[PDB]
Amino acid sequence: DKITVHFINRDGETLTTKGKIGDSLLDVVVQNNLDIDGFGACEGTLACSTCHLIFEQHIFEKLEAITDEENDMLDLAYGLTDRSRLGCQICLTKAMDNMTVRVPDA
Numbered sequence: 668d669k670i671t672v673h674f675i676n677r678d679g680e681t682l683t684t685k686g687k688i689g690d691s692l693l694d695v696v697v698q699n700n701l702d703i704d705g706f707g708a709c710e711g712t713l714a715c716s717t718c719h720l721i722f723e724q725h726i727f728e729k730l731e732a733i734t735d736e737e738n739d740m741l742d743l744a745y746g747l748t749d750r751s752r753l754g755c756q757i758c759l760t761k762a763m764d765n766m767t768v769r770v771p772d773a
């Protein structure tokens with residue numbers, strides 16, 4: 668029960684990494700050590716916005732609940748639209764199965 672993911676970069680933008688349904692925090696990327704130019708700016712615990720990165724709106728948009736409370740760190744994550752969503756505290760999912768993550772560039 669594993670799930671694949673795609674990581675966007677700058678050179679060829681189109682990384683990737685195999686994950687497991689139920690992964691832990693600050694996982695996946697690091698799990699493989701993907702480029703992830705930044706690798707958990709804060710180191711997690713919420714503080715940065717370069718963790719989850721852009722998330723297929725078909726995954727994020729599928730959430731009718733988000734406010735100053737939910738955001739916490741987001742708020743106006745330079746680049747955030749309707750797909751990205753800071754996590755660094757969420758386990759993998761079937762939705763992310765073959766998802767393309769893109770850093771907002773910070």
Ligand code: FES
Pocket residue numbers: 706707708709710711712713714715716717718719740753754755
């Ligand atoms: S690494 Fe900084 S909030 Fe996730």
